[PDB]
Amino acid sequence: MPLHHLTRFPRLEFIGAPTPLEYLPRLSDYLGREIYIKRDDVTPIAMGGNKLRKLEFLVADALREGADTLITAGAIQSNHVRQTAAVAAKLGLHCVALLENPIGTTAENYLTNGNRLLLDLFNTQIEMCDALTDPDAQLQTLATRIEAQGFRPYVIPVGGSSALGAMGYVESALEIAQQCEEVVGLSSVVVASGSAGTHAGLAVGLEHLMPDVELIGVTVSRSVAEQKPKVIALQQAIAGQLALTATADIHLWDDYFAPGYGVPNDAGMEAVKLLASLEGVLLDPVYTGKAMAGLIDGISQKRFNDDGPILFIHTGGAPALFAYHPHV
Amino acid sequence: HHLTRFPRLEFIGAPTPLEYLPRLSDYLGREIYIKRDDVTPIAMGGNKLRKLEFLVADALREGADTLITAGAIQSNHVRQTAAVAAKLGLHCVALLENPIGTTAENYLTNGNRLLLDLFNTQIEMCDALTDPDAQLQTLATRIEAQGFRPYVIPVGGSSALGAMGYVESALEIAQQCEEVVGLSSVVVASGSAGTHAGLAVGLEHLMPDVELIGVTVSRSVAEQKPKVIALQQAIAGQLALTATADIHLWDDYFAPGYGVPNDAGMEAVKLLASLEGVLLDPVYTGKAMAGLIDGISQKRFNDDGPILFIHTGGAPALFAYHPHV
Ligand SMILES: Cc1ncc(COP(=O)(O)O)c(C/N=C2\CONC2=O)c1O
Ligand SMILES: Cc1ncc(COP(=O)(O)O)c(C/N=C2\CONC2=O)c1O
């Protein structure tokens, strides 16, 4: 009921029913600790993900402005760009994607397979660039050129992580709260923390619906020092827009992404292997694999606030498995 | 009625979506709906999860500790079985063949085949699955001699028990379709036959006016019809029903063979992707959608009314089939 101001934002229906919240009995056995999973990897458009929730709000907003083109940015293998491109195609909007190679790879599958293949299936107009040094500004320049061609573009920022976009994860917290109700009394929630909309949206929602639960973001691209201010700003802007206050502290663990965004690491791949072999759940080498590696090491190192049930938010990413194989 | 008397595991939960496809409908000049069984929640999804609910229940009731099955290197059925084995703590042994003689690295190692590896699937390569039921049985015996307790899942999980999952799917469809329809037509890919046959039984009894058309993906009408019919009669027998409906099959859409992409198939993949953000695949749903399209093209359906396409999954093979062969 404190999140009722959410009702006032127009949104499209991309998801429908709440995504499953499942107990992981085999993984729990192995880690010695009750673990659950929020399956946002099973959202029903083009192989799923956390970005569909944000797109419900952002695309609603675009249509409301009479836009006919969605414009966004990410790595060649971004899930966000793939989701945005899938939603564009489904609604008959044009889509332009500004892409970069953040790891300097020349591997054929990174360059052409996985998410990148799907963009071509979606008739995505592709704009390569050297490095997204200033993505907000670089998106704007692109939007101007696109407009000059007569299109009516709507810029979706990196990962859809504006306060409006992040409303989808406030919404997700309501699902989670309901799903947990009488069930598992949760101590902790683990989510990947990248462009920050998921983390920030969950922070606001969980502070007001489950204020005793500890929320941990495992960084996938940045140190705590670089990432915290970004999650905080979004948290405050989301709160502002919902006429709430957000006093919770943001928690981040930055030990699990080295050597960099989009580079696999051993602990990441081990987590992917663990979850596949124990639960038939597919994680990914860029986001959820590193996040699950974080969760695991936090049990190892007694990093969590107590010994109680943990909820892992599965944010998607699996198509990247095929792009990352055999190596980058 | 009797469907309930069969033990089943919960792999799916809520009914899968049934969606109108307004952009595709607009382009074809015809109302089109899709049953999204590509969205089942385990390891990238598919039609086989429905069958596995019944078959794996049965395995557990016999105290098995190992699932054994067979398919192509890029089979979805094997990948779905392997995921289910992994999640239940069961070992899995997959008997694989290369049905198209390819040496392309992604066909051999990526897509579904990569996933088997992540699931710790024990892999048995063989030159050709000439007699899959027999070959599976021999395998089962050697596995048993190592002290395991194996349970054979036949190709495609298409035994009468396995096909109960698609009788079940017809219920979901029937209930979902009251808001909408009236359907004239349902289109599904017809391979090892469990999907086709189970839908045949369910739909005869729940929507007897709807025409069900299977687009073959591996065989001529002459070869496939007896297989679907046998399964239809066995399913009906086990539910103490009769099944008098004719089986309809279109075999024009799979040349030059099982597991080989064709132009119409890839054009169907491209069409659904660019119009609806839906992902089909080169082996199964792409060819099936090509058939639905050509049926409209050639006025092959019984009338001009709404069509339901059953999406049976397959998308991970897109990544195995790229760039070619
Ligand atoms: C599977 C997966 N998990 C997690 C995230 C991170 O959530 P976020 O913090 O982004 O809200 C992304 C999106 N990645 C977007 C953000 O980073 N670069 C991209 O194009 C993703 O695809
Ligand atoms: C996406 C997809 N569609 C359709 C089918 C065919 O369904 P059926 O008619 O067999 O129930 C399969 C079956 N996988 C079987 C079919 O052929 N060999 C296999 O491994 C499949 O993976």
From Swiss-Prot, chain A:
Function description: Catalyzes the alpha,beta-elimination reaction of D-cysteine and of several D-cysteine derivatives. It could be a defense mechanism against D-cysteine.
Any one Gene Ontology molecular-function term assigned to this protein's record: D-cysteine desulfhydrase activity
Keywords assigned: Lyase, Pyridoxal phosphate
Family statement drawn from the similarity comment of this UniProt entry: Belongs to the ACC deaminase/D-cysteine desulfhydrase family.
PTM sites of type N6-(pyridoxal phosphate)lysine: K51
Assembly and interaction partners: Homodimer.
InterPro entries the UniProt entry points to: ACCD_DCysDesulf, D-Cys_desShydrase, D_Cys_desulphydr_bac, TrpB-like_PALP, TrpB-like_PALP_sf
Catalytic reaction annotation: D-cysteine + H2O = hydrogen sulfide + pyruvate + NH4(+) + H(+)
GO biological process: D-amino acid metabolic process
Keyword ATP-binding part of the UniProt annotation: no
Cofactor(s) this protein cannot do without: pyridoxal 5'-phosphate
Pfam families recorded: PALP (PF00291)
Disulfide bonds: none
Annotated gene: dcyD
EC number of this enzyme: 4.4.1.15
Name the UniProt record assigns to this protein: D-cysteine desulfhydrase
Keyword Lyase: yes
